[PDB]
């Protein structure tokens, strides 16, 4: 079989969208409050996550169709899914050799211990690292990686979504593209699409645990005052 | 004449309060988002001001009597006066030679141009620098400097204040201390108390101009997202 023209254009648009919103040089990281190694890494990681949310918003705005959704649906999707896209996109800096996220220099190498010093526990970081390891072992093509981020973003089964039918149809098209790409372009990937859909399930679980632990942070003003306005807004509970 | 015992204790408490909340080493400044020289200094100066608000809160909590005010009055006073205390306390880093605020190293030397790159204009920065120059020329004793900050903080004529009588009585006591200190301990200071009360008037005017320009910043989300939660809360308009 073969990929169609419109499927090809979708892949091209998503790859360009990711390249425009993920900077492999990580040179912007020097702008964040510096890392410190009670919650000494919270200022730096709050800034990193806030920066990453802006990038996910930029990526979302270039997913075909997402822009044509209502403003409310665009927000509903980003508020539920941003944390999952950040976990997905961070796989690009994750290193199997170091078991850490390496962002171009030792100051911006984050191990599990660094994240505990931002207020998180092993209840989140143990499944998150196992998630990153298994995702990294899938050896995803860049095409597959950006499709999976877009499919995750365009899930209609999230709280607050109104136009369920329209969003599901968009996600259905991307899933069709991903299945066809794997079948035609990924040698020996007969089990790959299923493994990727499992990763989407894993992300729901990581989402819930992160939300639990973020709630605890956001309820202590001495910690929440270290967050950014954008993090407060996107990870907050307003409707 | 002579200062009384209770006047002496007030001066001692205010000096100790200032020493505990103003760190002449400025070593905490490396924790801020770094300075960059559209509004390239806004992240760094937002962090500096947010840090300074915490210090003013710490100073306020050690003013005799301020703690025994209601929580609402404590907040009303800090929300109206914090910007003025920051302008007063910054005189300690202001340099007549450089016309700038020099905070222990060239990275943390702020000239007028640096502050314009945080969203402010000469309508604020011209009177502010003239204010700093004239205040610096008063050659205030440390005792006089901390009394003036406490008197500014304990002004009952600010919006939101409820127990007007109680706060005015506290401010009256501090004014009495300051007049007696100048008369007894400041040689040739016969015009000093009057010049200091004029500076309090100047600060009302600097307050209004800063509030004008801060409102403009806080109404543009691409700028307000660079502020801190504490700055948003203290300089915000909620009651």
């Amino acid at each position: 079989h073969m990929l169609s023209d419109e499927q090809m254009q979708i892949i091209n648009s998503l790859v360009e969208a990711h390249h425009k919103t993920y900077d492999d040089s990580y040179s912007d990281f020097v702008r964040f409050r510096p890392p410190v190694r009670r919650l000494s890494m919270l200022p730096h990681l709050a800034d990193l996550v806030s920066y990453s949310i802006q990038k996910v918003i930029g990526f979302a705005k270039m997913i075909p169709g997402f822009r044509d959704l209502t403003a409310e649906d665009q927000i509903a999707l980003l508020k539920s899914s941003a944390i999952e896209i950040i976990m997905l996109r961070s796989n690009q800096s994750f290193s199997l050799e170091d078991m850490s996220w390496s962002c171009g220099g030792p100051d911006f190498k984050y191990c599990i211990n660094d994240v505990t010093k931002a207020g998180h526990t092993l209840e989140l970081l143990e499944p998150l690292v196992k998630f990153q390891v298994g995702l990294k072992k899938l050896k995803l093509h860049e095409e597959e990686h950006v499709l999976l981020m877009a499919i995750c973003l365009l899930s209609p089964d999230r709280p607050g979504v109104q136009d369920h039918v329209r969003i599901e149809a968009l996600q259905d098209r991307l899933c069709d593209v991903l299945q066809a790409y794997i079948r035609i372009q990924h040698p020996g990937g007969r089990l790959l699409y299923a493994k990727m859909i499992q990763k989407l399930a894993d992300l729901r679980s990581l989402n819930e645990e992160h939300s639990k632990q973020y709630r605890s942070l956001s309820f202590q003003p001495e910690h929440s005052m270290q967050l950014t306005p954008l993090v407060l807004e996107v990870f907050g509970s307003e409707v | 004449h002579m200062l009384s015992d209770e006047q002496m204790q007030i001066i001692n408490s205010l000096v100790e309060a200032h020493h505990k909340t103003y760190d002449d080493s400025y070593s905490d400044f490396v924790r801020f988002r770094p300075p960059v020289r559209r509004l390239s200094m806004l992240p760094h100066l937002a962090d500096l001001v947010s840090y300074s608000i915490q210090k003013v809160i710490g100073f306020a909590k050690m003013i005799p009597g301020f703690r025994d005010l209601t929580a609402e009055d404590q907040i009303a006073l800090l929300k109206s006066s914090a910007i003025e205390i920051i302008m007063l306390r910054s005189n300690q880093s202001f340099s007549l030679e450089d016309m700038s605020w020099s905070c222990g190293g060239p990275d943390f030397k702020y000239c007028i141009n640096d502050v314009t790159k945080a969203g402010h204009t000469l309508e604020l920065l011209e009177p502010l620098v003239k204010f700093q120059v004239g205040l610096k020329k008063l050659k205030l004793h440390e005792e006089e400097h901390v009394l003036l900050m406490a008197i500014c903080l304990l002004s009952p004529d600010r919006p939101g204040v409820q127990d007007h009588v109680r706060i005015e009585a506290l401010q009256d006591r501090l004014c009495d201390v300051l007049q007696a200190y100048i008369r007894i301990q400041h040689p040739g200071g016969r015009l000093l108390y009057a010049k200091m009360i004029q500076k309090l008037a100047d600060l009302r005017s600097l307050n209004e101009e800063h509030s004008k320009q801060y409102r403009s910043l806080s109404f543009q989300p691409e700028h307000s997202m660079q502020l801190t939660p504490l700055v948003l809360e203290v300089f915000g308009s909620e009651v």
Binding site: I75, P229 | M225
Partner: peptide, 10 residues
């Protein structure tokens, strides 16, 4: 609400 999100979503 969502002042910053609306702005970023253009």
């Amino acid at each position: 609400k969502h002042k910053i999100l609306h702005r970023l979503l253009q």
